[PDB]
Write a protein that binds this ligand. Structure first.
Ligand code: HEM
Length: 384
Protein backbone atom coordinates (compact mmCIF):
# COMPACT_ATOMS: atom_id res chain seq x y z
CA UNK A 1 0.00 0.00 0.00
CA UNK A 2 1.38 3.51 -0.79
CA UNK A 3 2.95 5.31 2.16
CA UNK A 4 3.07 9.07 2.61
CA UNK A 5 6.68 10.56 2.83
CA UNK A 6 7.61 9.92 6.52
CA UNK A 7 8.16 13.18 8.41
CA UNK A 8 7.83 12.29 12.12
CA UNK A 9 11.05 12.06 14.20
CA UNK A 10 10.90 10.14 17.50
CA UNK A 11 10.76 12.46 20.51
CA UNK A 12 14.18 12.46 22.19
CA UNK A 13 15.84 11.11 19.01
CA UNK A 14 16.37 14.32 17.01
CA UNK A 15 19.33 13.01 14.88
CA UNK A 16 17.83 9.70 13.78
CA UNK A 17 15.59 9.19 10.80
CA UNK A 18 11.75 8.91 11.17
CA UNK A 19 11.03 5.34 12.34
CA UNK A 20 8.45 5.13 9.48
CA UNK A 21 11.34 5.54 6.99
CA UNK A 22 13.77 3.06 8.53
CA UNK A 23 10.96 0.48 8.79
CA UNK A 24 10.29 0.35 5.02
CA UNK A 25 11.50 -2.21 2.49
CA UNK A 26 14.16 -1.00 0.00
CA UNK A 27 11.71 0.22 -2.66
CA UNK A 28 8.18 1.29 -1.63
CA UNK A 29 5.25 2.79 -3.47
CA UNK A 30 4.66 6.36 -2.29
CA UNK A 31 1.68 8.63 -2.51
CA UNK A 32 2.82 12.08 -3.39
CA UNK A 33 0.93 15.36 -2.40
CA UNK A 34 -0.64 15.71 -5.86
CA UNK A 35 -1.85 12.15 -5.90
CA UNK A 36 0.87 10.58 -8.08
CA UNK A 37 1.81 7.12 -6.89
CA UNK A 38 5.65 7.01 -7.27
CA UNK A 39 8.43 5.31 -5.29
CA UNK A 40 10.56 5.94 -2.21
CA UNK A 41 14.05 4.27 -2.10
CA UNK A 42 15.73 3.49 1.13
CA UNK A 43 18.59 1.03 0.44
CA UNK A 44 22.06 2.35 -0.37
CA UNK A 45 22.38 -0.01 -3.38
CA UNK A 46 19.07 0.88 -5.02
CA UNK A 47 19.69 4.61 -4.30
CA UNK A 48 23.06 4.46 -5.97
CA UNK A 49 21.30 2.89 -9.06
CA UNK A 50 18.83 5.74 -9.29
CA UNK A 51 21.46 8.41 -8.95
CA UNK A 52 23.82 7.06 -11.64
CA UNK A 53 21.32 5.73 -14.17
CA UNK A 54 20.57 7.95 -17.18
CA UNK A 55 16.98 6.79 -17.46
CA UNK A 56 16.22 9.04 -14.45
CA UNK A 57 15.80 12.70 -15.29
CA UNK A 58 16.09 15.74 -13.09
CA UNK A 59 14.08 18.03 -15.43
CA UNK A 60 11.24 19.55 -13.39
CA UNK A 61 8.50 19.04 -16.05
CA UNK A 62 8.76 15.25 -15.73
CA UNK A 63 8.49 15.41 -11.90
CA UNK A 64 5.84 15.30 -9.18
CA UNK A 65 6.79 17.59 -6.22
CA UNK A 66 7.85 15.79 -3.06
CA UNK A 67 6.05 18.03 -0.52
CA UNK A 68 3.85 21.19 -0.98
CA UNK A 69 6.03 21.64 -12.44
CA UNK A 70 5.60 23.42 -15.83
CA UNK A 71 8.60 25.69 -16.87
CA UNK A 72 11.95 24.71 -18.49
CA UNK A 73 14.90 25.33 -16.05
CA UNK A 74 16.30 28.81 -16.49
CA UNK A 75 19.60 28.97 -18.42
CA UNK A 76 22.44 28.02 -16.05
CA UNK A 77 20.17 26.39 -13.45
CA UNK A 78 21.96 23.15 -14.15
CA UNK A 79 20.76 21.06 -11.21
CA UNK A 80 17.51 20.64 -13.11
CA UNK A 81 19.14 19.59 -16.41
CA UNK A 82 20.15 16.31 -17.96
CA UNK A 83 23.27 15.52 -20.02
CA UNK A 84 24.26 17.00 -22.51
CA UNK A 85 22.90 20.31 -21.26
CA UNK A 86 24.05 19.65 -17.67
CA UNK A 87 27.46 18.64 -18.88
CA UNK A 88 28.23 21.93 -20.53
CA UNK A 89 27.83 23.83 -17.30
CA UNK A 90 29.33 21.23 -15.06
CA UNK A 91 32.52 21.10 -17.18
CA UNK A 92 33.10 24.85 -16.78
CA UNK A 93 32.60 24.83 -12.94
CA UNK A 94 34.75 21.77 -12.05
CA UNK A 95 37.91 23.89 -11.98
CA UNK A 96 36.44 26.25 -9.35
CA UNK A 97 35.69 23.58 -6.76
CA UNK A 98 38.84 21.39 -6.43
CA UNK A 99 40.75 20.98 -3.08
CA UNK A 100 43.26 23.38 -4.70
CA UNK A 101 41.01 26.27 -5.72
CA UNK A 102 39.05 26.09 -2.41
CA UNK A 103 42.33 26.14 -0.46
CA UNK A 104 42.70 29.75 -1.66
CA UNK A 105 39.53 30.56 0.35
CA UNK A 106 40.58 28.84 3.56
CA UNK A 107 42.30 31.83 5.18
CA UNK A 108 39.14 33.92 4.74
CA UNK A 109 36.90 31.02 5.99
CA UNK A 110 39.19 30.93 9.07
CA UNK A 111 38.88 34.74 9.65
CA UNK A 112 35.10 34.74 9.12
CA UNK A 113 34.71 31.91 11.60
CA UNK A 114 37.05 33.51 14.23
CA UNK A 115 35.34 36.86 13.77
CA UNK A 116 32.06 35.30 14.68
CA UNK A 117 33.50 33.42 17.59
CA UNK A 118 35.02 36.79 18.77
CA UNK A 119 31.50 38.36 18.62
CA UNK A 120 30.06 35.53 20.72
CA UNK A 121 32.91 35.93 23.28
CA UNK A 122 32.31 39.70 23.36
CA UNK A 123 28.51 39.41 23.86
CA UNK A 124 29.00 36.75 26.52
CA UNK A 125 26.54 33.88 27.03
CA UNK A 126 23.82 32.80 26.32
CA UNK A 127 23.64 33.18 22.56
CA UNK A 128 21.56 31.56 19.80
CA UNK A 129 24.23 29.74 17.79
CA UNK A 130 21.99 29.73 14.72
CA UNK A 131 21.93 33.53 14.34
CA UNK A 132 25.29 34.15 15.91
CA UNK A 133 27.37 31.64 13.91
CA UNK A 134 25.71 28.77 11.93
CA UNK A 135 23.69 31.02 9.56
CA UNK A 136 26.07 33.93 9.05
CA UNK A 137 29.33 32.18 8.53
CA UNK A 138 28.46 30.05 5.47
CA UNK A 139 26.61 33.12 3.94
CA UNK A 140 29.78 35.22 4.21
CA UNK A 141 31.77 32.29 2.72
CA UNK A 142 29.48 32.41 -0.35
CA UNK A 143 29.97 36.26 -0.45
CA UNK A 144 33.70 35.46 -0.93
CA UNK A 145 33.09 32.78 -3.46
CA UNK A 146 30.87 35.10 -5.46
CA UNK A 147 33.09 38.21 -4.81
CA UNK A 148 30.39 40.33 -3.18
CA UNK A 149 31.90 43.68 -2.15
CA UNK A 150 32.41 44.40 1.57
CA UNK A 151 30.03 47.37 1.51
CA UNK A 152 27.33 44.89 0.31
CA UNK A 153 27.92 42.17 3.03
CA UNK A 154 25.25 43.55 5.38
CA UNK A 155 22.59 43.53 2.62
CA UNK A 156 23.51 40.00 1.32
CA UNK A 157 23.48 38.61 4.88
CA UNK A 158 20.16 40.24 5.71
CA UNK A 159 18.33 38.71 2.75
CA UNK A 160 20.11 35.31 3.13
CA UNK A 161 19.22 35.28 6.87
CA UNK A 162 15.62 36.08 6.09
CA UNK A 163 15.38 33.22 3.60
CA UNK A 164 16.86 30.72 6.14
CA UNK A 165 15.28 31.80 9.49
CA UNK A 166 12.36 30.74 11.70
CA UNK A 167 9.24 32.92 12.00
CA UNK A 168 9.48 34.22 8.40
CA UNK A 169 6.47 34.14 6.13
CA UNK A 170 6.58 32.64 2.64
CA UNK A 171 6.03 36.15 1.22
CA UNK A 172 8.97 37.46 3.27
CA UNK A 173 11.14 34.62 1.82
CA UNK A 174 10.07 35.28 -1.75
CA UNK A 175 10.71 39.00 -1.32
CA UNK A 176 14.23 38.35 -0.01
CA UNK A 177 14.93 35.91 -2.85
CA UNK A 178 13.88 38.59 -5.43
CA UNK A 179 16.13 41.20 -3.82
CA UNK A 180 19.02 38.80 -3.80
CA UNK A 181 18.37 37.71 -7.39
CA UNK A 182 18.28 41.30 -8.67
CA UNK A 183 21.45 42.07 -6.76
CA UNK A 184 23.28 39.10 -8.30
CA UNK A 185 22.25 40.21 -11.88
CA UNK A 186 23.72 43.66 -11.15
CA UNK A 187 26.84 42.03 -9.63
CA UNK A 188 27.26 39.96 -12.72
CA UNK A 189 26.80 43.17 -14.88
CA UNK A 190 29.52 45.01 -12.90
CA UNK A 191 31.99 42.16 -13.24
CA UNK A 192 31.28 41.87 -17.00
CA UNK A 193 32.63 45.50 -17.20
CA UNK A 194 35.82 44.64 -15.26
CA UNK A 195 36.35 40.93 -14.58
CA UNK A 196 38.78 39.77 -11.84
CA UNK A 197 40.08 36.33 -10.69
CA UNK A 198 37.08 35.39 -8.45
CA UNK A 199 34.71 32.59 -9.57
CA UNK A 200 32.50 34.99 -11.57
CA UNK A 201 35.44 36.90 -13.06
CA UNK A 202 37.11 33.70 -14.19
CA UNK A 203 33.93 32.49 -15.83
CA UNK A 204 33.32 35.81 -17.62
CA UNK A 205 36.91 35.55 -18.96
CA UNK A 206 37.27 31.87 -19.83
CA UNK A 207 33.73 31.03 -21.06
CA UNK A 208 30.88 32.15 -23.29
CA UNK A 209 28.31 32.09 -20.36
CA UNK A 210 25.72 34.88 -20.66
CA UNK A 211 24.74 37.26 -17.85
CA UNK A 212 21.59 35.32 -17.34
CA UNK A 213 23.47 31.99 -17.03
CA UNK A 214 26.00 33.49 -14.56
CA UNK A 215 23.18 35.00 -12.53
CA UNK A 216 21.47 31.62 -12.25
CA UNK A 217 24.78 29.81 -11.49
CA UNK A 218 25.60 32.27 -8.65
CA UNK A 219 22.08 31.93 -7.29
CA UNK A 220 22.22 28.14 -7.43
CA UNK A 221 25.50 28.17 -5.56
CA UNK A 222 23.92 30.38 -2.87
CA UNK A 223 20.75 28.32 -2.59
CA UNK A 224 22.45 24.91 -2.63
CA UNK A 225 25.32 25.96 -0.33
CA UNK A 226 23.95 28.22 2.37
CA UNK A 227 21.24 26.37 4.29
CA UNK A 228 22.86 23.05 3.82
CA UNK A 229 26.13 24.15 5.40
CA UNK A 230 24.43 26.32 8.06
CA UNK A 231 22.38 23.41 9.18
CA UNK A 232 25.21 20.92 9.33
CA UNK A 233 26.95 23.51 11.59
CA UNK A 234 23.93 23.93 13.84
CA UNK A 235 22.66 20.38 14.03
CA UNK A 236 26.21 19.07 14.15
CA UNK A 237 26.93 21.21 17.21
CA UNK A 238 23.75 19.88 18.79
CA UNK A 239 24.90 16.28 18.11
CA UNK A 240 28.35 16.91 19.57
CA UNK A 241 26.92 18.44 22.72
CA UNK A 242 24.61 15.46 23.13
CA UNK A 243 27.51 12.97 22.48
CA UNK A 244 30.43 14.79 23.94
CA UNK A 245 32.80 11.75 24.03
CA UNK A 246 33.04 12.50 20.30
CA UNK A 247 34.55 15.97 20.69
CA UNK A 248 38.02 14.50 21.42
CA UNK A 249 37.59 12.61 18.17
CA UNK A 250 36.85 15.74 16.10
CA UNK A 251 40.30 15.80 14.46
CA UNK A 252 39.89 12.28 13.11
CA UNK A 253 40.34 12.38 9.29
CA UNK A 254 36.79 11.27 8.51
CA UNK A 255 35.02 13.12 11.42
CA UNK A 256 33.18 15.54 9.06
CA UNK A 257 32.19 12.63 6.84
CA UNK A 258 30.68 10.81 9.86
CA UNK A 259 28.73 13.92 10.80
CA UNK A 260 27.48 14.17 7.15
CA UNK A 261 26.36 10.46 7.28
CA UNK A 262 24.77 10.49 10.76
CA UNK A 263 22.85 13.75 10.30
CA UNK A 264 21.89 13.36 6.57
CA UNK A 265 20.39 16.83 6.61
CA UNK A 266 19.19 16.52 2.99
CA UNK A 267 16.50 14.49 4.43
CA UNK A 268 13.18 14.52 2.60
CA UNK A 269 12.76 12.51 -0.62
CA UNK A 270 15.82 14.21 -2.18
CA UNK A 271 17.37 13.45 -4.56
CA UNK A 272 14.27 12.70 -6.60
CA UNK A 273 13.98 11.90 -10.27
CA UNK A 274 11.53 11.18 -13.09
CA UNK A 275 11.76 7.79 -14.88
CA UNK A 276 12.25 8.40 -18.63
CA UNK A 277 11.69 4.67 -19.33
CA UNK A 278 10.51 1.57 -17.54
CA UNK A 279 13.33 0.62 -15.11
CA UNK A 280 13.55 -2.52 -12.98
CA UNK A 281 14.83 -1.66 -9.46
CA UNK A 282 15.45 -4.23 -6.62
CA UNK A 283 12.73 -6.39 -8.19
CA UNK A 284 10.14 -3.55 -8.47
CA UNK A 285 9.05 -2.17 -11.82
CA UNK A 286 9.27 1.63 -12.08
CA UNK A 287 7.32 2.83 -15.11
CA UNK A 288 7.94 5.71 -17.48
CA UNK A 289 6.66 8.92 -15.87
CA UNK A 290 7.01 7.75 -12.28
CA UNK A 291 8.85 9.99 -9.75
CA UNK A 292 11.33 8.11 -7.56
CA UNK A 293 12.44 9.78 -4.33
CA UNK A 294 15.43 8.80 -2.21
CA UNK A 295 15.34 8.73 1.59
CA UNK A 296 18.93 9.65 2.27
CA UNK A 297 18.78 9.40 6.03
CA UNK A 298 17.94 5.68 5.77
CA UNK A 299 20.44 5.13 2.88
CA UNK A 300 23.10 6.44 5.26
CA UNK A 301 22.05 3.98 7.96
CA UNK A 302 21.79 0.90 5.62
CA UNK A 303 22.90 -2.16 7.72
CA UNK A 304 24.45 -3.85 4.61
CA UNK A 305 26.74 -0.85 4.23
CA UNK A 306 27.67 0.49 7.69
CA UNK A 307 28.50 -1.18 10.97
CA UNK A 308 26.58 0.12 14.07
CA UNK A 309 24.76 2.57 11.69
CA UNK A 310 22.85 4.31 14.46
CA UNK A 311 25.85 5.36 16.52
CA UNK A 312 27.76 8.62 15.98
CA UNK A 313 31.34 7.56 15.74
CA UNK A 314 33.75 10.14 14.39
CA UNK A 315 36.65 7.65 14.16
CA UNK A 316 34.51 4.95 12.38
CA UNK A 317 36.39 3.22 9.47
CA UNK A 318 33.45 3.10 7.06
CA UNK A 319 32.06 6.72 6.96
CA UNK A 320 33.00 7.34 3.29
CA UNK A 321 30.31 5.10 1.80
CA UNK A 322 27.70 7.76 2.82
CA UNK A 323 25.58 9.50 0.18
CA UNK A 324 25.01 12.76 2.14
CA UNK A 325 26.24 14.56 -1.01
CA UNK A 326 24.01 12.70 -3.49
CA UNK A 327 25.47 10.70 -6.36
CA UNK A 328 25.82 10.60 -10.06
CA UNK A 329 26.05 13.57 -12.30
CA UNK A 330 24.39 16.00 -9.86
CA UNK A 331 26.63 14.88 -6.93
CA UNK A 332 27.29 18.04 -4.90
CA UNK A 333 29.55 20.48 -6.76
CA UNK A 334 30.36 22.35 -3.58
CA UNK A 335 31.40 19.28 -1.60
CA UNK A 336 34.99 20.37 -1.07
CA UNK A 337 33.94 23.84 0.13
CA UNK A 338 31.41 22.45 2.46
CA UNK A 339 33.93 20.04 4.00
CA UNK A 340 36.41 22.84 4.69
CA UNK A 341 33.71 25.12 6.08
CA UNK A 342 32.56 22.33 8.40
CA UNK A 343 36.00 21.23 9.49
CA UNK A 344 37.02 24.86 10.24
CA UNK A 345 33.72 25.70 11.80
CA UNK A 346 33.35 22.72 14.24
CA UNK A 347 37.05 22.74 15.21
CA UNK A 348 37.26 26.47 16.00
CA UNK A 349 33.96 26.58 17.75
CA UNK A 350 35.04 23.79 20.24
CA UNK A 351 38.62 25.16 20.63
CA UNK A 352 37.30 28.55 21.59
CA UNK A 353 34.58 27.33 23.88
CA UNK A 354 35.74 23.99 25.38
CA UNK A 355 32.94 24.50 27.92
CA UNK A 356 30.10 24.95 25.37
CA UNK A 357 26.76 23.54 26.41
CA UNK A 358 23.13 23.88 25.56
CA UNK A 359 21.49 26.83 27.33
CA UNK A 360 18.02 25.24 27.41
CA UNK A 361 16.94 21.61 27.89
CA UNK A 362 17.38 19.37 24.79
CA UNK A 363 13.63 18.67 24.70
CA UNK A 364 13.05 22.42 24.04
CA UNK A 365 15.16 22.62 20.89
CA UNK A 366 12.85 23.10 17.90
CA UNK A 367 13.54 21.04 14.76
CA UNK A 368 13.14 21.84 11.02
CA UNK A 369 11.07 18.79 10.33
CA UNK A 370 9.42 19.78 7.04
CA UNK A 371 12.32 21.84 5.64
CA UNK A 372 14.45 20.69 2.67
CA UNK A 373 17.57 21.01 4.88
CA UNK A 374 16.90 19.45 8.32
CA UNK A 375 18.37 21.21 11.37
CA UNK A 376 17.47 23.33 14.43
CA UNK A 377 15.45 26.63 14.31
CA UNK A 378 17.49 27.92 17.22
CA UNK A 379 20.31 26.58 19.38
CA UNK A 380 20.76 28.55 22.62
CA UNK A 381 24.22 27.78 23.98
CA UNK A 382 26.35 28.94 26.95
CA UNK A 383 29.84 28.54 28.18
CA UNK A 384 31.80 29.39 31.32
C1 HEM B 1 29.56 25.47 -0.29
C2 HEM B 1 28.49 24.76 -0.06
C3 HEM B 1 27.80 24.06 -1.23
C4 HEM B 1 27.67 24.46 -2.49
C5 HEM B 1 28.34 25.72 -3.11
C6 HEM B 1 26.81 23.45 -3.13
C7 HEM B 1 26.47 23.42 -4.46
C8 HEM B 1 25.74 22.43 -5.08
C9 HEM B 1 25.34 22.38 -6.51
C10 HEM B 1 25.60 23.48 -7.57
C11 HEM B 1 24.69 21.24 -6.72
C12 HEM B 1 24.04 20.73 -8.00
C13 HEM B 1 25.17 20.04 -8.82
C14 HEM B 1 24.70 19.58 -10.19
O1 HEM B 1 23.47 19.51 -10.49
O2 HEM B 1 25.58 19.20 -11.01
C15 HEM B 1 24.67 20.54 -5.46
C16 HEM B 1 24.09 19.29 -5.28
C17 HEM B 1 23.87 18.66 -4.07
N1 HEM B 1 24.36 19.08 -2.85
FE1 HEM B 1 25.53 20.72 -2.53
N2 HEM B 1 26.51 22.44 -2.23
C18 HEM B 1 27.05 22.84 -1.02
C19 HEM B 1 26.91 22.25 0.18
C20 HEM B 1 26.16 21.11 0.41
C21 HEM B 1 25.97 20.48 1.69
C22 HEM B 1 26.54 20.85 3.11
C23 HEM B 1 25.28 19.38 1.43
C24 HEM B 1 24.78 18.37 2.39
C25 HEM B 1 25.34 18.11 3.57
C26 HEM B 1 24.92 19.30 0.05
C27 HEM B 1 24.19 18.29 -0.53
C28 HEM B 1 23.89 18.21 -1.89
C29 HEM B 1 23.18 17.09 -2.48
C30 HEM B 1 22.51 15.92 -1.76
C31 HEM B 1 23.10 17.42 -3.92
C32 HEM B 1 22.43 16.50 -4.97
C33 HEM B 1 20.97 16.94 -5.19
C34 HEM B 1 20.31 16.08 -6.24
O3 HEM B 1 20.95 15.12 -6.81
O4 HEM B 1 19.15 16.34 -6.57
N3 HEM B 1 25.55 20.34 -0.58
N4 HEM B 1 25.34 21.27 -4.50
Amino acid sequence: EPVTLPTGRAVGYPFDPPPDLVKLPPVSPMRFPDGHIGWLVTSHAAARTVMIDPRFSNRPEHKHPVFSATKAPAPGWFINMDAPEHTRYRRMLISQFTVRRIKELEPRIVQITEDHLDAMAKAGPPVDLVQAFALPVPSLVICELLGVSYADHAFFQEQTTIMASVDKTQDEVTTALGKLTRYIAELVATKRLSPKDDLLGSLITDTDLTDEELTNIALLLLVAGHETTANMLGLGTFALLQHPEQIAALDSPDAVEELLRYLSIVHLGTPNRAALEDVELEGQMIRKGDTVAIGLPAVNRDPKVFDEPDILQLDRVDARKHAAFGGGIHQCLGQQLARVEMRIGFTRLFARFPSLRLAVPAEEIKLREKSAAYGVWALPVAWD
